[PDB]
C-alpha cells in the first residue's frame, strides 16, 4: 500500500514490446496525447488494487519506457490499456517493483 505521483494521458473505450507500439500508433493518430497537463494525481498501489480501481487478477502487464520524462501502460480485463505518465524512469520502474510482490501477496 504505497502511494505515488503521476500525470494522466488517456484511455481506450505477445510481449511488452507490442504494448508500446499500440500507444505509439494511438499517439501518432491523436487518440491519446503526448504531453499531458501538469495535473498531479495519486497512484496508490495497494493489495486490493490500483488506487477508479483496477483488479489484481485481471491485470496482466505493466510497461515503462522513455516516450527526460516517461510513460506507463496497463492491461486490465475485450482488453483495456490504461496509459499514464511518470516523473522519471526510475520511479516508473519502481512501480513495477511494488507489483512484483503485490502479485506474490495473492
Amino acid at each position: 500500500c504505497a502511494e505515488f505521483r503521476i500525470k494522466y494521458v488517456g484511455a481506450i473505450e505477445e510481449g511488452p514490446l507490442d504494448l508500446i507500439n499500440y500507444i505509439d500508433v494511438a499517439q501518432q493518430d491523436g487518440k491519446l496525447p503526448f504531453v499531458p497537463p501538469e495535473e498531479e494525481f495519486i497512484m496508490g498501489v495497494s493489495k486490493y488494487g490500483i488506487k477508479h480501481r483496477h483488479a489484481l487478477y485481471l491485470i496482466i502487464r505493466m510497461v515503462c519506457y522513455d516516450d527526460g520524462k516517461s510513460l506507463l501502460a496497463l492491461k486490465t480485463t475485450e482488453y483495456s490499456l490504461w496509459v499514464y505518465q511518470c516523473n522519471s524512469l526510475e520511479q516508473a520502474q519502481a512501480i513495477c517493483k511494488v507489483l512484483s510482490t503485490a502479485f506474490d501477496s495473492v
Binding site: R61, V63, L99, S100, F103
Partner: peptide
C-alpha cells in the same frame, strides 16, 4: 543496465 521494465501475470 535496463531501459524498459515489465512484470507478467502468472
Amino acid at each position: 543496465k535496463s531501459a524498459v521494465t515489465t512484470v507478467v501475470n502468472p
